[PDB]
Amino acid sequence: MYLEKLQQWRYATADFSGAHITDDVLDKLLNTTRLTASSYGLQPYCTLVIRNKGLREQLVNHSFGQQKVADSSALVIFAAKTGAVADIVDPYISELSQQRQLTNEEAENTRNYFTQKLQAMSAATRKEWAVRQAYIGLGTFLLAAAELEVDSCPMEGIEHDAYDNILSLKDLGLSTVFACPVGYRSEADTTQFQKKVRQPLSRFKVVL
């Protein structure tokens, strides 16, 4: 399978070159990510793009000294929607309305249905629900990056609240879930030649 070949090409890049990543490439990567399935189709997360070097150097200090946060072409941050329920529901209803040519009443009934269902969860449960959806997105993103021969590294090893504070995400109703520097591996990154370690299928598949 092609996706198996993509799985073998990618790796958790340790050292990036100084090569630039174009906006066209990053847009292709995030456009493919955008089409990922989500719970109820609500897509309760987004992808932030940061290139500014100064800002990213600040994030290194809140990424346990992991320099690749800044020393890469760009940084993508996946952020969950953790603010007003309306910021999750309304943008979906607008798209649903337009795409499915719904009547005003039908749109309002769907808006109500999802608003009530999300309000039924606690803030904590809703946040983790959103976080989970973003992890599905990461799965897409890692393969989309491989198709484009774009290197990356997913990073949970960051100070989440510090990222949120530094980037003022609170006024956007967002919460950092994980970060992914993107770019092109350094010639000098010897970790690209380590053999991949994965569960064999005899352990990963359990027939009941």
Q: Is the dihedral of CA 143, 144, 148, 154 positive or negative?
A: negative
Q: What is the DSSP string of 165-185?
A: HHTTGGGGTEEEEEEEEEE-B
14 secondary structure, DSSP code: S
Q: Would the annotation count 157 as a binding residue?
A: yes
Closest CA to 81 of 25, 23, 39: 39
Q: Which of residues 157-176 bind ligand FMN (CB under 6 A)?
A: 157
Closest CA to 58 of 183, 167, 177: 167
Cα–Cα distance between 172 and 168 in angstroms, integer? 8
Answer for which of 57, 86, 139, 170 binds a copy of itself (CB under 8 A) is 139
Answer for which of 3, 5, 27, 37 binds ligand FMN (CB under 6 A) is 37
Cα–Cα distance between 109 and 93 in angstroms, integer? 10
Q: Which of ligand FMN, a copy of itself, none does 167 bind, CB closer than 5 to 8 A by kind?
A: a copy of itself
Answer for which of 69, 138, 150, 158 binds a copy of itself (CB under 8 A) is 138
Answer for which of 24, 156, 171, 187 binds ligand FMN (CB under 6 A) is 156
Q: What residue ranges bind a copy of itself (CB under 8 A)?
A: 1-4, 7-8, 10, 12, 27-28, 30-37, 39, 41, 43, 46-50, 52, 55, 79, 91-92, 95-96, 99-100, 128, 131-133, 135-144, 147-148, 154, 156, 167, 172, 194-201, 203-208
Residues in the annotated binding site: 10, 12, 66, 68, 156-157, 196, 198
